[PDB]
Every structure is written in structure tokens, then in C-alpha cells.
Amino acid sequence: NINENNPLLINSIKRLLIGSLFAGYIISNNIPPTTIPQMTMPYYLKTTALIVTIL
Amino acid sequence: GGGAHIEPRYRQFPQLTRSQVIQAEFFSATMWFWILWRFWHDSDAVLGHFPYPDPSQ
Amino acid sequence: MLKYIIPTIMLMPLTWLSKNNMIWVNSTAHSLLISFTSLLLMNQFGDNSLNFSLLFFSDSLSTPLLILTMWLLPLMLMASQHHLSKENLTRKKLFITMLISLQLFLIMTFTAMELILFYILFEATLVPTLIIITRWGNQTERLNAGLYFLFYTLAGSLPLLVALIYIQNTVGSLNFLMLQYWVQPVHNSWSNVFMWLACMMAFMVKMPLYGLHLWLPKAHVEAPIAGSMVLAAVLLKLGGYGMLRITLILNPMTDFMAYPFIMLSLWGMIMTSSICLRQTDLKSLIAYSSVSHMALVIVAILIQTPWSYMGATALMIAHGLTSSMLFCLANSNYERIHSRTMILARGLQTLLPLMATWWLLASLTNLALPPTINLIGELFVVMSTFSWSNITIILMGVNMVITALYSLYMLIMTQRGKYTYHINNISPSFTRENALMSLHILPLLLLTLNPKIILGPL
Amino acid sequence: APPLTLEGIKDRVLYVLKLYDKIDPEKLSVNSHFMKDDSLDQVEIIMAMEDEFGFEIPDIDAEKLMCPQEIVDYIADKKDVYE
Amino acid sequence: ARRYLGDASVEPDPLRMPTFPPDYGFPERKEREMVATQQEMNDAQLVLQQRDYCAHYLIRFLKCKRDSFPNFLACKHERHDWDYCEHLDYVKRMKEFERERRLLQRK
Amino acid sequence: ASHITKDMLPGPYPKTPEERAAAAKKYNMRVEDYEPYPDDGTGYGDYPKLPDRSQQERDPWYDWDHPDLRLNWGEPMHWDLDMYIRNRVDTSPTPVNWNLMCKHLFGFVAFMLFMFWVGETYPAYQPVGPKQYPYNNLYLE
Amino acid sequence: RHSIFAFTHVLIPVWIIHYYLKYHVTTKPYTIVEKKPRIFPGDTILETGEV
Amino acid sequence: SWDKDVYPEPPRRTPAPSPQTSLPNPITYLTKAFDLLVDRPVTLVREFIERQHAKNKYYYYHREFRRVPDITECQEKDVLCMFEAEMQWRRDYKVDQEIVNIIQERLKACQQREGESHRQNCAKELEQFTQVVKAYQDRYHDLGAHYSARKCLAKQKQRMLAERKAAKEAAAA
Amino acid sequence: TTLDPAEYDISSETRKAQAERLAIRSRLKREYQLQYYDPSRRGVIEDPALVRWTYARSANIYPNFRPNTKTSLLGALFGIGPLVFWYYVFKTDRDRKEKLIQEGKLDRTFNISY
Amino acid sequence: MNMFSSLSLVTLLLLTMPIMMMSFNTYKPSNYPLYVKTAISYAFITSMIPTMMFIH
Prior knowledge:
part of a larger assembly; 10 chains; D: mainly alpha; Non-ribosomal Peptide Synthetase Peptidyl Carrier Protein, Chain A; 42% helix; G: mainly alpha
């Protein structure tokens, strides 16, 4: 007895994912800075936590 | 009770309304439009690096 | 009180003088008219002090305390009409007059101007309350509880006459608390220890301790008809304020022996809260709650130094409205189920949805929701005894945690299913059941708007 | 939101007679009494409705389930069927 | 570099500084690299952990952020230049442990 | 107004067979494993004949329990053993006593000794001697 | 309309609470306590400039 | 209103926004419309009361007291002279409470003004406020005689300890 | 922990005449439902299992009681025990704090409150 | 500058209006999940305004 046709729910999901994907990319795009970044991420020490997600 | 918009089934794969699938299709693309700014233009480390900082002499 | 006792004594030749069943609507009608006269001439300013007229009134200047004394008589007559209407009219009117007579001594009390008029008024009670326990109560084992209601308060209060006349013949005269300017100090002796002992121990008979308090879950357990004088017994327990009058002066400097009154009221504080999570009685359920955070105020007084008199002024009226309101909840749900045992009340919340809001906000005054009159004073008890030492927050904080369970232990008992029984208990909460259930939080949160009047000197 | 009537169970109890390959679709429809067709013929005959219906099948449901329409009888009392 | 002597005023929160606080500083090359200004370090609201090197370029990098109000990026090459001022400063400080393994051992 | 065997009495050996069940039917005919012998140990202020404790216990747990209501909600007639601790308590699961959680909390008890160590990123360990050289030794020049 | 269902909702309590702030600063000695300028150059609001 | 010497602050010093870009900004559309939708229902009605409130005036007067005795009068067991001295001393204490509240928000004037520096500046309020509250609990706070209010019978006798044991029993100051 | 709980045992044929212990309760259950089903009751059931519960728990424990054993005098190790101990904590307290308050100072100078 | 936080106090006031209309004082033909959703719907742009003044 599946059912997915209610525009009340369609209004909710469409409003979130438009704001969801642009969440970290608009707010942090315009912000006064507060601290100093790292700016050094060496060999064998930089992005391997992404590889941890791959396995 | 009141409405028969979506039919009951007995595992015959009751079909969809064929209008939700358009909006399903659209937001599978604009999320992969956002594969543009993943590399273009954005790198893993726009910093520069150190030459194993030896030359103290 | 210029003329406050004067109009209310004229209410007494009006009960048996009146007609038939008109006596309820007439007695409530006159009674609320005095309540404005209480508000009007009082609440004046205010800077040390308002000596009122003469040798019979000091106007309750430092602590008002007297507005709460006058709500209850136009509040219990609507409550006592639940199960009283089965007797002769001349016998029912006597039960009306004795409760009105209870207020008149307490109207002169709490102001009292003196100390030799204090003790005769401090003992002017216990005569009408005892008769209420004897006739028109509940089932048996009344009479021993009437004897335990005596023989403690009278046992401890008799050395006050040993104490006070020993002060009256020694240094000046105790007619005036304001002629107490010259006060000699009191050194450590073997005679002066007993002088402080008799000065204090009688006040521990009324506001209880971990000792000597077995009588307190007798009068509240074996109680009159439906919480009738039980509401008055709330003010009877909190009305032991006179330690604020006396020990503010008149051996203040004996604090070397304060410690066994600090400690006994502190481990007994955390204990008597948990002494009722396995109790099987509703009227005993609020009774042991009424021991714990009433025992909170005692360490606020023997520890001196205000930021402790601030909250202790408000903590007397804290449960004084709350436990009076909880007894109104317990006086209800008994005319419909004729046993007070809490376990039989499974399957509530569905038959009475209207009073179910009143269960919520009442028990929300024990968690107490910090913008109220309850957690505005308990923060000042924190503010005092933490300056004493750093350990005192531990046992006092768990008291705020045990009654968190102990209050919601009652609320969840209302929610059950299919109720098994009850072709009786039909009545969907009539007008008397909910209008009387009002007028408790309705002044309480009202006082939380500008809580300036609820403050001592201090 | 979808309701239910008497005709749905009159399909399924008759259908599982033919679904189980041990029982041919030539028996009686509603009253076969199951003795003409100890364990695995009072439990396995309702182990399929453990898969489809599956409301845990209590202990008293075994001794009633001989009469195959008396199977169907109390479900309408449990499932609160129409009228 | 900094820290000669005598902080005269009684100002705590050490913003009353000798010249400017480094990370550790200096140590070798250069032994004195000074800093920037201090009359505007307190006048313009610039918080602590920002009185380090490459400061006057950062005070100008923060100018065009307000001076371009409906903007997403003022000058993206300038952030790569303040970072190049930062990263070359850091690699200059990364020559400590190569010196510390070398100069501190016996010779 | 029920006076005949209104409560328990000074038991438990005042002809204990005539206790259950002349009244207070905790046992049927004094052999039901619930005859009023179970006065724990008396002398104290425990229960006397007491239609009370050490009867089969540790849960009324709201079971399937269809022959009456009979579990905890719906009033079986007279089977009182103990109460006021059981509206929130249960029976035994599949595992058993083994306190492995203290051994599970012992996983950081090895690394509690690691809390004494330091966490500098660069360089690597080389833990053989004082050649690591942490702090400042010499001056500028 | 979208004429008074929102106008009773939002458009009426605007004027009341702004009157409660304009009649507040002249009475209370601590009004709004807005912070410093945070200005790196010197500008036309002052008379001097900065490099 | 009040007096500005009681509540000082430095002048406001608000700079220019410096747009510098030809891009459309929304701040030139907000302040140019919302100002008139507030000034019409507020300021004119504020003016309408302003003529109406000036219809009649009502007076309320200052209360200045009379202080003839100060401390040492009178003899021990008396009542009359030792009642006005209580009215002296106690009203000489509730004044001394809210004097501190002026100096307390004087600190709060500095802290929510600078914010960024906020410690190494303003040059007074970490000192002067601690030159008041430090000179407060001595001899003006009956520690812990504040319960019985110490009315002229212990507030002088801390100051007896502040002259007998203090400044002479330093051996030998 | 609490418990095993021994949900299985042996039978066949231990105590063949032990059955019909439900005959005790089904007679009461027949006495229950006959009391439960009636055209006019309008009230609760008496239910004497709860009558014999609280009154033999709240009361009738002190007539049961005697101090003929020291495990009834065992409450001395729980009531007065820690009550001395808190004072044994607190008497060591408030005086060590006082000596540092009398001799020497440690407080801040802006401690008006308190 | 006064309207920096004044719109916040308007945002901190209109939440009470579905509560003030719970007292059956000429209440709306019920539609209460709809009426609450409308009551939230206008506060968001009111909340959006002073965020722009803060970042300047």
C-alpha cells in the first residue's frame, strides 16, 4: 500500500535540499576571519582519512 | 475509504504516478553539477610545501 | 490590626443565627470582604519599622506573612462541603465556628508585639485542631494520633516559660522587641548551654527534624473529612517562624554548638525524601515531601548572615501554597474512590482530562521551573551555605534530584489502561472540584511577576 | 488508511492450500479439517501465515486450527473486520 | 628580536608588548625582523593571536572585505599572497629541528 | 469492616497449616510452596504469617498472560507476594553475569598510562636516546 | 488577501515596540551600548587618514 | 534625564561604509523605505500625546532628612538618643549600596565598548572599582554581624577592632 | 546478574497429584467474574489482597517486632553511623578554613558578596 | 541602528500570538496547523534582516 504523492511532504523535502547542499558553501563563503589556518599538511599525513572512508 | 489514487497491490509492482520521477531526476543532476566546484576550482591543498627544511648553514 | 479581629469575630454570631442551607453561601460572601482590608492598611513603608499602634501590634513589618493567613478560610469551606452534609444543622455549624475561631488567634499571632503574649498565643492553637481529629474524621486509630498530636508540642514548649520569665526578671522586659537594644552577650558555660537549649528546642517540635517527627504522618494520614483542617495544618507547621523573632538577638553568639542542628537536619534531609518512594498512601505521599524542603529552611537561619534571610522568607510560603494545593488534589479523587491508597488509581488521565492539566503544573512546582517563587529562594540557600564550605552543595543538590523522581513518581501513576473496575467514579470534575483547585497558582505565578513584596528586612 | 473486509482472508486461507505443494488444489475450500491432509502439519500449515500475517500465533491458536474455517473465524475478531 | 626590558605600564593581557609577540622567535635568520604598527593595532579592533608577522598585509586584506560589501571574494590572489607570507614564514620556522638535531649534538 | 484475619499475626508456627488457607489463600492446602513458613527469619520486623515474601518473585513483568489479566495490569484476585519495586523491573536475558564492561572500560586503562606521554606532531619518534632534543639549548649565534 | 490576515499579525506590533525603545533611551542612562569602529585606515568621518 | 558626568563614555566615532563597487547592495533599499513606515505611526502619535500630556502638570518633591546626632551620643542603656542614631546609621547604609551599582556599570561601560582590547585599556575601572569594593567590606560590612543588622552596636566595634588591634598591635605601629 | 533465572526444569512424572493449583484461583476467578458482571454494581471491588497488604505492612510490624536479636539492633550501623561521619567531616571543616581566614589572607579584595 | 535589535524583539513577540489566540478570544476558524505555519512563515524574512547589518 505504498504512497509517495503528497505535495505537503514535497514542499518540505525540496526546501531542505536546496538549503542543505549550499549550507557550508554560502555561510563560510562570507565570514570575518577569527583565527589562523593550518596551511601545512605534509606527505603521508594529509588526506588519508578520506581513504579511511573508502575502505 | 475515500480515495483510490494509488491502488492496493499483491506484489505486482504497482506503478508510480510518473510525475514525481521528473523532480527525482532533476535533483540527481544539480548535485552533480556541484562536481564542478569540487575540483574546478578547488584543490586538496592550495598551500605550498617545505623542502624538508634542512639548509641551516 | 486596628480592626481586623473586630470584623471577623462578628462573623461568629452569624452561623447558627442564619437560616438553612444559605449558611454556606452567606459565610463565603462576608469572608472575602476582609481580604481587601488586609491588603489596604498593610504593605506600607517601611524603613525600620512600622510599630503599628501600641502594645498589641507591631504590624508584621520585617516579614508581611499575613496575606497567606487569610486566603484559607474562604478556601476550605468550598472544600469541606464534599463529605460533610450528612449531620444535623446545629452540629455542622459548630464545625464551621471552630475553624473560624482558629483564624482569630492566628490573626493576633504572627504580629503579637511581644513575647509574653506570644507564648499564650503560640499555645492558643492545638485546641480546635485536636477536636477536628476526634469528631468527624476517618476510620480508627484516631485517638492515639490525637495523643501523639499532643505530648510533643506541649512537651517541648513548657521550658519557654522557664526561659522567658527568667529573661523578664533578669534584663529589662520582653514586652517590646524594639526595647531589645541593650543585649548582653552570652559566653560558653554549663548554665548558658541550657539557656540556649530551651530557647530553641520547642521550635523544632513544629517544623520537624529527623528526630521527634513520627506524629506528623499521623495527623496527615489519619485526617479529617477531605483535607479540611489538613490545609490549616500546613500553616500550623510553617507558622513556627518565631525563631526569626528570638534568636536574631538573645544569645546570637553561641554557634559553637550549632553543628548538631546543622548536621542532623542535613543527613535527615536527604533521607526522609527517599523514605517514601515505597510508601503506599497518597496522604502520606505529600507528607514526607513536606518534611524535606521544609527542613531546608532551618540551616538558612542558624547560619546567620543574609542572602540567607532572603530565600528563607520565600521558602516558608513556597510549599505553603504548593502542599496546600497538593492536598486539594488529594482531597479530590477520594469522594469518587473511597480509599486513599494510590495503587488502586490505575487507569486515570482518560476519564478526567480537565484536571490533568492541574496535575502537571502542580508537580511542575517541585521541579519548580526557575522563574517561580520556589527556585528563586533555593538559589539563595545555595548562595549562603556554599560560603560556609564547599561540601554543602552535595547533600543539598541531591535533594533537588530525589524529589525530581519523587514528584514524577506520582504523575506517571495516573497513566494506565483499561482500569479493570469503576462502575462508580463517573463524575467528570464538577464546578467545585476545579474552581477550588484554582486560586492557588493564580496568585503564585502572579507573585512571580514582581516578587518584591516577598522579601524580609533582610 | 486502507480498510479491510471479510473477502481478503477468504482469498488467502484458500490460496495457501494450493501454495503448499503437499496439498493439491482439489481439497475442500474452507472445511478440510486437516486430518485427511503431529508436528509440521499443525505448525507448518500456519508457518506460512507466520511469514505473511505473522502476529506471533499464540499457544491457543494450535488446538482451534483443526477446522480450517475456525482459523478464519477469530481473525475477524482480532483484526476487527467490518460490521 | 623583541623582549628587551621594562614593561612600564601595569597593563595585563600582554597587549602592552615589547614590540610584538612572535610564535617563539626569532631565532636565526633573521634574528630581528621587527613587526608592524602598534598605535593602530589597538586602535583598529584586532584581537590577540593576530599580532604576529604578516600583519600589515592582513590589515589591508581585511580592508577590501568591507570595502566590497556585496562581494563573495575581494581579491583571491591576496589570500594566496597572505598565505605565501604565512607559509614562507612557517618554513623559515621549520628550520629549528634540523638545526636542533645538528647544532645541539656533540661536535 | 473485615475483622476475621484482617492482617497477619504473630507467626509463623501457630498451626501454620491452619493459616493457609482458613483465610488469606496464599497456599491451597499448606503444601503449595507458598505456605506461610517463609517468614524469612523473623525476630526482626519482617513479615509474620505474612501473605508476603519469599514466594516466587523477581518479576511481574506484563507477560502474554491471557488466562486472566493476571500479569501486572488487570487485578488477579489474591496472589500478593511483593510490590512497589516491580512496575519497572524484569526477568533474565540470553547472556549471563560476565562483567566484561569493566574489561571494556579497561581498554583506556592501558591508554591511561598513555595520558602521561606527549603529542608533538613532527618529527618522528626515534625513541632510542636523547638525540630527539625537544627544547631550546643554544642561542642565536 | 493577504490584506489583514498578516497585517493584524505582523504590521500592527511594529509601531508599539519601537515607541517602547524611543521612550527608553532618554529615560534609562544605559541605552544601546554599540561597540567601537574597527577601522584600519583613517576616513572622512574623522579628519585624519592612515596609510 | 540624567547627568553625563555620572555616566561617561568616549564619543561614538562611526566610520564610512565605503562601498567602492558598482554592484547592487541591499542596504540602499532597506533604510530608504523602512524609516517612513515607523515615523508615521510612532512620531506623530508621540507628538499627539506631547501636546496632550502638556495639558496639566503635577509636582512631586524631594525628601531631605535631618541629622543632628552622629555616633557617640549617648549613654549605654538609653532608648531615645539610640533610636535616631539607628535612623542615622541604617539610612547611611542603603545609600552606600547603590553607590557601588553606579561604579559597577561604569566597568560595564568600558567592556562592551572596546571588546577587542578590553583589558589593557580604560585605565581606571579595574583600579578604581577595586579601590571602592576593597574599601567597602572593612568597617562598613558587618561580617558576619549583618543578620542582626549590627545597628550601632557592632558597626562601631569592628571599628574598635580597626583601631585597637589594628594600627597599634603591629608591634609597634 | 539477577537472574539465571532457571526457566526450565524436569518433569515426567514428578508429583502427578500436584496439578489443579489453578482450581484455587479459578474458583476465585469464578467468584471474581460473577462479582464483576452484574447489572448494577457502581463501586470498586473490595479486593482483600490489597487490604491485607498495606495494613500488614504500614501497621502490624511493631507488634511483630522484638529487639531479641542484634540484627534488629543492626540499624545502629546505618542511622547514627554516617551521622557522626558527616560531623567528623564537618568538624575538621570550617576551622581549617577559619585559621587561614584568621591568620593570613587568601580571599580576593572585591568579595563584598558573599 | 535602533532597528538592528528592534526586529529581533518583534521576532521574539509574535510567537505569543498563537498562544494569545488559544484563549478563544474571537479565534480563527480553526485550521491550527495551517495558522501556525503561516505565523512562522513571516518571521523568517524578519529574522533575515539584521544578519546583514551585523556582517558589515
